[PDB]
Amino acid sequence: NRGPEKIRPECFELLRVLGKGGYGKVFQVRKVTGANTGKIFAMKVLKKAMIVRNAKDTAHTKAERNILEEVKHPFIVDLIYAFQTGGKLYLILEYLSGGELFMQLEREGIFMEDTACFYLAEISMALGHLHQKGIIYRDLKPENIMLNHQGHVKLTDFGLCKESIHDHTFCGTIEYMAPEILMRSGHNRAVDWWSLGALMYDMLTGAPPFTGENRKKTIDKILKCKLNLPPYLTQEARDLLKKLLKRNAASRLGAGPGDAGEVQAHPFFRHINWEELLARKVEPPFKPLEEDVSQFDSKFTRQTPVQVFLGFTYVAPS
Numbered sequence: 001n002r003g004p005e006k007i008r009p010e011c012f013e014l015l016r017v018l019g020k021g022g023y024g025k026v027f028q029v030r031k032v033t034g035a036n037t038g039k040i041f042a043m044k045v046l047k048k049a050m051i052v053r054n055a056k057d058t059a060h061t062k063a064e065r066n067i068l069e070e071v072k073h074p075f076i077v078d079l080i081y082a083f084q085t086g087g088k089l090y091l092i093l094e095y096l097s098g099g100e101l102f103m104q105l106e107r108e109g110i111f112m113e114d115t116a117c118f119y120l121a122e123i124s125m126a127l128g129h130l131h132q133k134g135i136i137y138r139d140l141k142p143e144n145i146m147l148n149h150q151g152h153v154k155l156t157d158f159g160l161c162k163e164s165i166h167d168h169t170f171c172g173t174i175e176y177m178a179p180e181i182l183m184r185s186g187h188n189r190a191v192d193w194w195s196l197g198a199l200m201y202d203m204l205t206g207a208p209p210f211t212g213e214n215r216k217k218t219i220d221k222i223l224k225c226k227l228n229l230p231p232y233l234t235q236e237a238r239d240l241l242k243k244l245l246k247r248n249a250a251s252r253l254g255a256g257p258g259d260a261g262e263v264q265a266h267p268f269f270r271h272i273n274w275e276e277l278l279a280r281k282v283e284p285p286f287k288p289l290e291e292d293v294s295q296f297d298s299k300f301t302r303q304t305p306v307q308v309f310l311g312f313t314y315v316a317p318s
């Protein structure tokens with residue numbers, strides 16, 4: 001009765017702050033009008049004025065908008081609306097109440113192989129679909145991996161960088177960045193299987209494979225590449241990681257003509273029914289405690305909101 005919806009900032013109620021950064025804020029919000037009223041979303045708010053200052057920032061912002069519209073997949077975060085005002089860009093994504101999956105590592109100290117297995121497979125599906133659509137993830141990290149309500153993986157940062165720091169690859173943690181990214185010898189589709197390697201390692205030992213005393217030193221360690229394999233590891237987890245964490249790109253598992261399927265065919269995934277896995281029919285090893293703000297804080301509080309970009313405006317179907 002009266003139109004379709006023109007989604008506006010005033011359709012949402014600002015409930016908590018989930019993330020602050022140089023380029024904008026992530027809020028937790030409730031839709032209060034029309035359509036799903038009462039449903040909870042995450043609302044990423046970006047500052048137009050500062051993005052258009054820099055072309056590399058304009059790219060990711062536009063790409064994120066693109067990818068989230070065009071690349072939908074069960075282990076990738078859903079975009080539900082997008083819209084803009086003068087001076088601001090808004091993105092309303094699904095609210096991921098499970099929180100970060102490396103916070104589960106804080107509590108588990110470390111992840112059981114069979115438990116890491118589930119998370120790694122789902123991750124791989126996402127990465128593999130991401131490739132089928134010609135997208136390379138660059139800087140995958142444990143922060144980029146989140147957990148929906150029932151506790152399944154969802155990939156997360158496709159736009160700008162959360163940092164407020166800005167010192168684009170050296171702003172936050174580099175421990176999960178392939179040598180080539182550091183040697184600026186490009187990237188490639190096999191850069192993401194490195195990152196999967198680093199994540200596995202962390203998932204089992206609680207640390208990235210090579211760390212140093214400081215940046216310079218870190219970068220070094222990584223390039224040096226000497227790999228330390230805790231004893232308590234089963235042969236196949238050993239097997240898998242050797243292959244993945246390979247100095248040279250060409251040589252990593254997942255690099256081949258068909259590659260995320262081959263990664264998946266590895267004996268470490270022998271128990272994984274991809275059919276039901278992607279149907280989200282396997283119960284996840286972790287099911288956390290809808291609005292529950294618990295796993296983001298305590299750091300974040302105080303809710304309040306501070307040419308190109310044509311077609312940014314968007315409503316998801318379904």
Ligand SMILES: CCc1cncnc1N1CCN(Cc2nc3cc(C(F)(F)F)ccc3[nH]2)CC1
Nearest residue numbers: 018019020021022023024025042095096160162
């Ligand atoms: C919007 C997806 C999401 C959904 N549900 C619950 N948690 C989520 N988060 C909240 C935390 N977030 C990390 C993050 N990215 C950021 C980007 C910015 C930027 F404004 F771009 F500069 C600022 C702060 C940021 N914090 C990961 C995704």
Ligand SMILES: [Zn+2]
Nearest residue numbers: 161163166171
């Ligand atoms: Zn940055």
